[PDB]
Design a protein around this ligand. Structure first.
Ligand SMILES: O=S(=O)(O)CCN1CCN(CCS(=O)(=O)O)CC1
Ligand SMILES: O=S(=O)(O)CCN1CCN(CCS(=O)(=O)O)CC1
Ligand SMILES: [Fe+3]
Ligand SMILES: [Fe+3]
Lengths: 400, 389
């Protein structure tokens, strides 16, 4: 594995330091074995300035080489700011800058890829293990700009999907929030949602891009929370392509395609939910490890297991609920507590990952949850503020 | 050659007619080979409504079969609005709705040199393979072509600092540093597109066939610039009317990296989306007196931002002369001003600022008759159609 650092600085058009700076950069472009990219762009905050971006990768954490680069660079008369992937707090946390920089995550999957747990129903199924390998390879080799490869799903795989699909769809009209009921016929009409067929990520991605500008990247398995959440800042949802083992169709701890496509996807075609999800993403950009953990908890209690109130009734929008017959049939009962959602209240709350939730949070609306997440993000100590530019598909850094 | 039609209609959630509607749509999809696409989306106005889009393609103009489809469709209980590519005015003008639809445009002094004419065909062939989503194919330029680029480059670079608007001087070193701009090498469109995308969201497509004014201007609405890759004949010194790659890359491209200019250019494109033929002509002429031959005001000086000035030494010399008339840019004045294409311009229009020109264009285009309100959504990168007319 590798650790990324980024160095950035600005210089005004017409500075007599530009000539020497460019010479210095050409040198390290050729001779520095950790430099991966050097780019310059118009400043987004000062019309007469240029921004420079230096990206590096190092084999070890806290690699003292970057200090050498900073020193050399500042001898050319510019003031560098450095971001780094690290457990240390020497520099503020690194983040991907460009939507295409999500390619860096491609081979960073923690678990639930082609390495299964011994109690996994398919752990000793040689055909299933080979399949998981095959499908994982696709995510590992996927690049921004590519079409997502279509999977030729087998008859057994399609059968498992159908069992899940048919069980869940009976419960949606009575248990899901109305945005789900609004969006679902469009998925049938445009993305091939049906019991007889597993929808392809590329079709879903195209549909979401045109609705809310969200898009899908295939992923091997679980990413780290920072990486997954950072992807959300770009309105990019990482989704798996494999399906759960046929022997246990009504439950799995893994985010298989049933969970992604039936739980996560529909709400992303709703503009307010889409903005809310991106807000969570933006909050994570360059956030401390502590705050990432708070954001994961907020995500759990909203995107994964959130409830909405409609009149006197409670409905589910959380993906973990919408994709589980158990959970759908649990939340409506008085067997679980409900509280109004508030990131300052919810972020500290504990939760089980191997049972139904004993506590759910109810959001008033996705617009209010968005505004609430922005208050939360602002309460973080961040070295700078950030801003998404949909035209350039890029994070812009702002002072203070 | 193909004539595209589009049929739009809306239907409410929980309508009684949806079932039969969907059935009808699935049958014609299967059995009508002229139906290329049928799609439905959330409405941009009524939160409870669905928008439907039917795309059709026929070999001839004003195909009577469209009417038949409108009829059967409207029998299922919806009110259809039809747009069409046609020289007639039975239907309002068709337009591309997403960036990939620009694929539909694709098929559509010493030039009497057989080698050079064979070369032009070859470059067109290499370009002809491009479709949205691809990398723009690179051109392996010949030794002579690169030599010609070098002469034009070095000459024009001598004049820019004293004659070009400040945005051009600002961006050019970035083109040098990130896109390989130099006199020794011709930059490839794919590198330029990537850089533009990362500055202002603008993209390049290679020119395949030559584009109608409607098609080219419609491209601008998606912040897509069509650019040619061929290089001028050597017998062309500076033809001082030569829309080759030198003109695209040294003239048009640098300004597209300026955020305000990039918005102004797209504004012209938006105005063109679904505009009548006579309104398209107004916009082409506005485009000529701005994007191609416009001047800017810099303090007490006049400078050039027009690509046709920036890529012509003769034009750059000519605009500052007193015999060249200058006027403040006003689209109502500029839009029906006649102009020469094979001589220097006797008249130039001067823009105060690109944000002002953008606002002027939007005001200019506000009364254009259209069946729909048109707008651009930066998150979806698509045209939103509002049925509020
Ligand atoms: O419906 S679509 O998904 O196509 C675009 C929805 N759009 C997203 C961006 N926000 C403002 C961003 S912010 O200023 O609140 O950060 C307005 C609503
Ligand atoms: O592409 S860039 O990131 O460089 C700037 C994109 N540009 C910014 C300014 N807004 C003005 C909307 S309005 O002022 O007309 O309402 C249009 C989009
Ligand atoms: Fe999930
Ligand atoms: Fe031109």
């Amino acid at each position: 594995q590798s650790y990324h650092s980024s160095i950035f600085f600005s210089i005004s058009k017409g500075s007599d330091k530009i000539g020497g700076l460019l010479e210095y950069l050409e040198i390290i472009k050729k001779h520095n074995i950790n430099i991966t990219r050097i780019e310059s762009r118009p400043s987004k905050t000062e019309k007469k300035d240029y921004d420079f971006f230096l990206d590096l990768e190092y084999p070890t954490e806290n690699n003292k080489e970057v200090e050498k680069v900073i020193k050399d660079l500042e001898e050319k008369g510019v003031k560098a700011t450095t971001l780094q992937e690290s457990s240390n707090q020497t520099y503020a946390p690194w983040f991907p800058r460009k939507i295409s920089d999500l390619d860096l995550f491609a081979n960073k999957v923690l678990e639930m890829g082609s390495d299964l747990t011994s109690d996994h129903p398919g752990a000793s199924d040689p055909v299933y293990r080979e399949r998981r390998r095959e499908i994982a390879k696709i995510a590992s080799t996927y690049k921004h700009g590519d079409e997502i490869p279509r999977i030729d799903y087998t008859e057994e795989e399609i059968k498992t999907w159908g069992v899940v699909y048919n069980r869940l769809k009976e419960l949606f009209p009575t248990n899901a929030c109305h945005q789900h009921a609004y969006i679902f016929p469009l998925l049938e009409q445009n993305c091939g949602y049906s019991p007889d067929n597993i929808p392809q990520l590329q079709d879903i991605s195209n549909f979401l891009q045109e609705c809310t500008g969200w898009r899908i990247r295939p992923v091997q398995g679980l990413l780290s929370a920072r990486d997954f959440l950072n992807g959300l800042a770009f309105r990019v949802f990482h989704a798996t392509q494999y399906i759960r083992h046929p022997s246990v169709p009504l439950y799995t701890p893994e985010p298989d395609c049933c969970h992604e496509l039936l739980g996560h996807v529909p709400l992303l075609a709703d503009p307010d939910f889409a903005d809310f999800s991106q807000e969570i993403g933006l909050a994570s950009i360059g956030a401390s490890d502590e705050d990432i953990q708070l954001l994961s908890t907020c995500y759990w209690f909203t995107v994964e297991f959130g409830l909405c109130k409609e009149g006197d009734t409670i409905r589910a929008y959380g993906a973990g609920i919408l994709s589980s017959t158990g959970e759908m049939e649990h939340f409506l009962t008085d067997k679980a507590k409900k509280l109004p959602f508030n990131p300052f209240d919810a972020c500290n709350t504990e939760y089980p990952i191997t049972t139904f939730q004993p506590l759910y949070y109810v959001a008033e609306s996705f617009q209010k949850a968005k505004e609430q997440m922005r208050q939360f993000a602002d309460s973080f100590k961040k070295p700078f503020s950030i801003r998404y530019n949909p035209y350039t598909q890029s994070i812009e850094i702002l002072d203070n």
